[model samples]
Target: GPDLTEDWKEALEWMRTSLEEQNYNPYEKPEYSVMSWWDYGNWILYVSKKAVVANNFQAGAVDAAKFFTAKSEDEAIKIAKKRGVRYVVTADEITMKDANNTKFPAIMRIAGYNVDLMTEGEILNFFNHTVLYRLHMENAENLTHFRLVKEFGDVKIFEVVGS
Candidate 1:
């Protein structure tokens, strides 16, 4: 069931329509995968063969996907190249901010522990919580490995440079 009022549902529907129009079945083929928030990933998982984050149905999937995903632009190209991921379709563009971002200050309030001691998975989860609603995007333009294919407002489609 989808909540009609939610923008993400519409976006997901749009993706489905687009893929269907092109006669692309990403679920049956391994050529596609998605990296997005844990919440929105369900639709991707249901419709596609791979997703970076989704429901708890796959226990270690998130940890595994993180190996290819990037938290910064400097690492995106390398990771995409290493993983052989050709396309990077984003529902929203990455927007940068500092502690001034409301989520950062609120999350900082939960700070009494040692972030340095947290595992990589824990750190990523923390970052997800802090930025999931805001696209989980890190800003940068020096993507030598990826080239912009198109943009629909905040949504963007990119292809691996060599692919």
Candidate 2:
């Protein structure tokens, strides 16, 4: 769980330059996920419990094959089941049902979307999502006060990964 300050600087530079120089259809599927918002490669920089639960999914960076972004929590859970993987919903929308007057966020891994939360079995269990869900729920329960802290921005892709 350490940050390589030097490597980060270099990698960030390469990424920025790639963004500034590359010319392509930014709205494309793979392209949108690669640009400044959340590159799986950049994620390799930080992917850890401290990072994720703390709202930083960047310290426990691993190979891109190991990570992905989900359009929704249900989709995320489904992907986890298909790949026999585990995932977390890193974001969500606000609802009036929020007891704290803020968006209720959760990160859960299941045996697929719509699976039983109470089921017990000997499947390849995913641990990270469990931790994330626990943390997000606990935050909502105790904080009694949720904060809308993320800003929506215009994102454009710079280049493809491994290119």
The C-alpha TM-scores of every prediction are: 0.42, 0.23
Local accuracy by lDDT, each model = 0.41, 0.28
lDDT of 2 by residue, 1-163 (tens): 2343443444444444543554444333121222122344545553442222112333222211122223234443333333222112222221112323312221112113322343333111332234223223333222211221222221111121122
Model 2, position 70, has a per-residue lDDT of: 30
Best by TM-score: 1
Note the residue pairs that clash in candidate 1.
Answer: none
Question: Which runs of model 2 end up more than 4 angstroms from their true locations?
Answer: 1-4, 29-163
- Tell me each candidate's RMSD, in Å, in order: 7.9, 16.3
* Model 1, TM vs. native: 0.42
Question: 75, model 2: CA deviation in Å?
Answer: 19
Residue-level lDDT tens digits of model 1 in 96-156: 2332232232222233335456655665466554322222253224444555555555555
User: Which candidate wins on lDDT?
Assistant: 1
